[PDB]
Structure 1
Amino acid sequence: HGHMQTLIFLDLEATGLPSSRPEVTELCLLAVHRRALENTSISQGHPPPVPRPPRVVDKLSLCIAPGKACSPGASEITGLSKAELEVQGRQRFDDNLAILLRAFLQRQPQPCCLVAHNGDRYDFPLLQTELARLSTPSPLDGTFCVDSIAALKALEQASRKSYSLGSIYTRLYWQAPTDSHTAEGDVLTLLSICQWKPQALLQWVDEHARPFSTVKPMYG
């Protein structure tokens, strides 16, 4: 493949941890063209200012009704619960959602790469499982993906620590992240850390991006 033209930052909130065979409760996508990223001002200072998000971005944030209740742990940090989602008429992960996801992705210049923090262990496998439950073919069969933990790890060692979203943000900017544990809030925080070294991050992504189709489902 060539250079990724669009980076789609992703975060999912769910009913719980992998062992519980969790289901998605919230999903946020933030598509950013590589030009927007390489155009972000280089960070200067220690700590440097938090990068300014690009003006031109595409965003999607959706709350989804899970097939089962959230565990006390997931609900307390995400602020979501099956009862509230359902009473508010949220629908399950279905064909229409897949259609919506495909259309959102098609608005972006290809090739495109999904970027998620701990995505290789959580987000990508979970999304794969959710899509596998549907009848239609996956809309991500032409999309690439990459875990931002590995990326930042490389970027930091090139410039043992916790590589959690908030820990990295705090390490780099000496500032506290906002709206943690909400799909949009975490996506916005991820965007900021990936904007730390724009050029280096883009290059690393280009070198490590892999087909989402190769992602193994979290559970069958």
Structure 2
Amino acid sequence: GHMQTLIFLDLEATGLPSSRPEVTELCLLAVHRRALENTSISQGHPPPVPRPPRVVDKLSLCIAPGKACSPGASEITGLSKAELEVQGRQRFDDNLAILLRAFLQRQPQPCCLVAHNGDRYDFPLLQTELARLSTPSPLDGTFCVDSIAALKALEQAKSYSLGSIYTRLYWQAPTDSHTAEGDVLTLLSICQWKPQALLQWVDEHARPFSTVKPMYG
């Protein structure tokens, strides 16, 4: 029982890995170990969608990319570079790294980032964006874990997309899909399904974020 904070994370971006995407939106949801522990273990078929913990730290930010979003990404996320820039959104810069550091500094250590498909998308992309910056990465010292690999172990004890798992467990469609905060809240609910077994798995399988290879560059 070492991981004191789980930070549920989701990124929106301009496109898929092959297009060399840039982050357009981020959401961080810091939840203390004890808040997940004291969430009710799901009963019934289907169980009701769990209530999020009262004590929560939330950060959600819109970020203007250097390159335009793909038509498909704009459609699902509701975001475009044009609209982000005309509403005065700033680039993924050093000030944002300072912002994230101060947010992470407020959380009891050790910390672990939780992201759906994080190992193939969210973590390597974030590593790439932070690599561009002159100031050292604020995610050095923090851990990370993929919730797909987490739920795959919890279920086995066909689609593993965020929506599919949410509808399987709760017989309800997720709200605000493909938005950073919406997907984080959807991720939280799925992780609140068996939160004690989830936390034990995180402890055993969480790896340092500094071990994550960048998506590109």
Distance 1:153 1:42 in 2: 18
**TM-superposed deviation, 1:35:** 0.1
Distance 1:155 1:51 in 2: 17
Percent sequence identity over aligned pairs: 100
**TM-superposed deviation, 1:134:** 0.3
**TM-superposed deviation, 1:42:** 1.2
Give a deviation string over 1:26-76, Cα, whole Å, max 9, x none. 000000001000000111111111111101100000000000100011100
**TM-superposed deviation, 1:128:** 0.2
Moved over 6 A (4+): none
Distance 1:163 1:99 in 2: 34
Structure 1: gaps of 5 or more residues: none
Normalising by structure 1, we get a TM-score of 0.98
Give a deviation string over 1:72-113, Cα, whole Å, max 9, x none. 111000000000000011000000000000000010000000
Distance 2:152 2:171 in 1: 18
Give a deviation string over 1:158-201, Cα, whole Å, max 9, x none. 1xx11100000000011111000000000000000000001000
**TM-superposed deviation, 1:139:** 0.6
Normalising by structure 2, we get a TM-score of 0.99
Count of residue pairs brought into register by the alignment: 217
What is the match of residue 159 of structure 2? 162
SS state at 1:11 partner: strand
Distance 1:34 1:49 in 2: 22
Distance 1:21 1:8 in 2: 25
User: Matches of residues 38-49 of structure 1 in structure 2 within 5 Å?
Assistant: 38-49=37-48
SS state at 1:122 partner: helix
Distance 1:195 1:155 in 2: 12
Structure 2: gaps of 5 or more residues: none
**TM-superposed deviation, 1:210:** 0.4
What is the match of residue 66 of structure 2? 67
SS state at 2:215 partner: coil
